């Protein structure tokens, strides 16, 4: 049993296993206590499993947010850091509210940020939004683009109907069968 | 007058933090030289945004 | 403005002096909102 | 003119507040050492005007009072 | 006997089971003391369960509110932070008041945040609202959109009926039968 | 077993093995505890292995971001140094949202940096984006440049469709078989 | 067995061996623990290997970056020392993104530096870029000028297509066979 990765997190190992089982190679997950997890594969599947590690860029990085750069425990916070910490929690709350719709499995929402808001004498510009979604299959995903636009329009001060762009898609084919051990 | 209250209590908050931190430390000056000019320059950067706007 | 067009060339020696020692982020700022009245509050 | 002197004393108090903190952070460290007889006005005055030039407030006040009336 | 997730919370582990039992695989909620819960699945049901973990993005993240970025435990607070802490409590009180209607199982409300227009001479803009809901089936959900807009209209300063958008949907089919163990 | 590289880490050794196995030489990853990993090749394959190390510039440097040059623990934070972390977390988040499309394996997004637009008397310029991507084999990669150009457009203040540049490509041929031992 | 270099680095000894092995002389890499590696060569090959050390200026100096002349741990940071640390990380991120294209092995980008426009009232000027690349052979390296020019043209605020200079070339012939021992 050759060793691919070690020292992973918990949700970093369920992504590598779910990627490797899509390509007919079977991996074993081994806990090592405080030192994390580890993933081992068989011997003839080694030179084919390092290729999908390099291709899919595994292990996954932690997902980044705008509110992580400006920590709340600073002694003094600028008016730029308070509006960036506002808009990052708004797009984090609108993303979790999009997953409770009828058919949506996952979603992601982006807002335009204002950076030079108070440093100019100019008033701020209009607000633009964008969204992505993944739907359960068997759904007419062309008519379901008019509900996310209606939901996202009057969740802000004044956005137009052409300043919102929704790009959504159905999910991939299901993997339900076992890979299979390599007989030699 | 809420921006008069917030700016009038951040000054007393910084006197307790800044002037009272080497009280509990001394009860080394190069590491405390760079900390004080960051906070005073940022508090003065904030009070003009609360003043001229 | 006929014989007032004599002095605007007379103040050119003071005008090349008021650009060398003033910043041109304040020179145009009192204009777009080089003039002789737009450079003294910036110099 | 009454509302203008009121706004001028409000902006003028706003500027007053940071320096007050600058004063006691000099007298705190001078009382932390054995310099209780030394007056703090010879050490507080150097760091009162480098906070004003690094912030270069001569351009910040002059641009802000124009931007309260005019527009670009 | 093979483990999927460990060190979970209570509401996390109570949702991974409710997702796995929808897709004909069963799991076990094994307690571990103060180390949190853990979920194990059978060996023929391990390959499909990693696929539905990756698809549904499990375990669920904790829900984010806007009042968490501007905490009340701080000593001195900006007027921008007090305004953003006020609107995030009206946003939760209207959500808890929507669940007491006749038929609603869950609901979510979003308020348009405006913090930077209150300081300048420009007046604040009209405030916008948007809501989602999930109704019990058998209900005529075309007529029940007019009292959600009636309840939400004059609960604020000045809104119109065009600045409120309600997107609601009936609940899914009931899951009542047991999944079944993999026979061998 | 002539060593050629040692003291690497987990993500660098999985790149050097994935590169050398593409050119018909096999390597051996040896763990050494706290001293990292080590990579050994055979004596007939040593001359070619040094040539592909020099050609592909292995071992790889860690990837750089703009937010590392301006750390949060720098307690003096200029307004010049707050927009560089706000830009650097947006370009780190847009490329994490580009990878969740239909067929994308990897992506990279660059934004034009303007930082001194707040201190001069000039208005700020437009925003210029640019993106690279890698798709699956068998995809109509000509019509999928309008979904990235539509998703990227209204995610900022005001960009045009001639200010976005998308250079995308397909992946290489897969490497699955074993390199084979040098028989002597 | 006459040594010619000692105390070298890991990446330095791999650059000395790959130069000597190209010119039909073989070298031995000997580890010494804390004092680095050391390269020894045979007695009939000592005259040639000294000539290629003198010609190729070996051992290689470590590669310099512009962000090393202005360290971030300094207490006083100028606007010049912040604009130079910004461009010195955009210059590294662009050459790290050029290597993920379809056919590039190495790349090097040069951004034009502007310093003395910020302190005085002089306006800034147009920014110039320059690039170098090494492509895998068998590729049409004349058609790939427009893909690098299109990717670089939209990563800054104002560049022209005649302000970007790309000079690229194909790689050398591969060195796959062994040098051979000098018999006497």
UniProtKB/Swiss-Prot annotation, chains A, E, F, G:
<keyword id="KW-0813">Transport</keyword>
<dbReference type="GO" id="GO:0009306">
    <property type="term" value="P:protein secretion"/>
</dbReference>
<keyword id="KW-0812">Transmembrane</keyword>
<keyword id="KW-0564">Palmitate</keyword>
<dbReference type="GO" id="GO:0009279">
    <property type="term" value="C:cell outer membrane"/>
</dbReference>
<keyword id="KW-0998">Cell outer membrane</keyword>
<keyword id="KW-0472">Membrane</keyword>
<keyword id="KW-0843">Virulence</keyword>
<comment type="similarity">
    <text>Belongs to the YscJ lipoprotein family.</text>
</comment>
<keyword id="KW-1133">Transmembrane helix</keyword>
<keyword id="KW-0449">Lipoprotein</keyword>
<keyword id="KW-0653">Protein transport</keyword>
Swiss-Prot record, chain B:
<protein>
    <recommendedName>
        <fullName>Surface presentation of antigens protein SpaQ</fullName>
    </recommendedName>
</protein>
<keyword id="KW-0843">Virulence</keyword>
<dbReference type="Pfam" id="PF01313">
    <property type="entry name" value="Bac_export_3"/>
</dbReference>
<comment type="function">
    <text>Involved in a secretory pathway responsible for the surface presentation of determinants needed for the entry of Salmonella species into mammalian cells.</text>
</comment>
<dbReference type="GO" id="GO:0009306">
    <property type="term" value="P:protein secretion"/>
</dbReference>
<keyword id="KW-0812">Transmembrane</keyword>
<comment type="similarity">
    <text>Belongs to the FliQ/MopD/SpaQ family.</text>
</comment>
<dbReference type="GO" id="GO:0005886">
    <property type="term" value="C:plasma membrane"/>
</dbReference>
<keyword id="KW-1003">Cell membrane</keyword>
<dbReference type="InterPro" id="IPR002191">
    <property type="entry name" value="Bac_export_3"/>
</dbReference>
<feature type="transmembrane region" description="Helical">
    <location>
        <begin position="28"/>
        <end position="42"/>
    </location>
</feature>
<keyword id="KW-1133">Transmembrane helix</keyword>
From Swiss-Prot, chain C:
<comment type="similarity">
    <text>Belongs to the FliP/MopC/SpaP family.</text>
</comment>
<comment type="function">
    <text>Involved in a secretory pathway responsible for the surface presentation of determinants needed for the entry of Salmonella species into mammalian cells.</text>
</comment>
<protein>
    <recommendedName>
        <fullName>Surface presentation of antigens protein SpaP</fullName>
    </recommendedName>
</protein>
Curated annotation (Swiss-Prot), chain D:
<protein>
    <recommendedName>
        <fullName>Surface presentation of antigens protein SpaP</fullName>
    </recommendedName>
</protein>
<comment type="function">
    <text>Involved in a secretory pathway responsible for the surface presentation of determinants needed for the entry of Salmonella species into mammalian cells.</text>
</comment>
<feature type="transmembrane region" description="Helical">
    <location>
        <begin position="11"/>
        <end position="31"/>
    </location>
</feature>
<comment type="similarity">
    <text>Belongs to the FliP/MopC/SpaP family.</text>
</comment>
<feature type="transmembrane region" description="Helical">
    <location>
        <begin position="35"/>
        <end position="55"/>
    </location>
</feature>
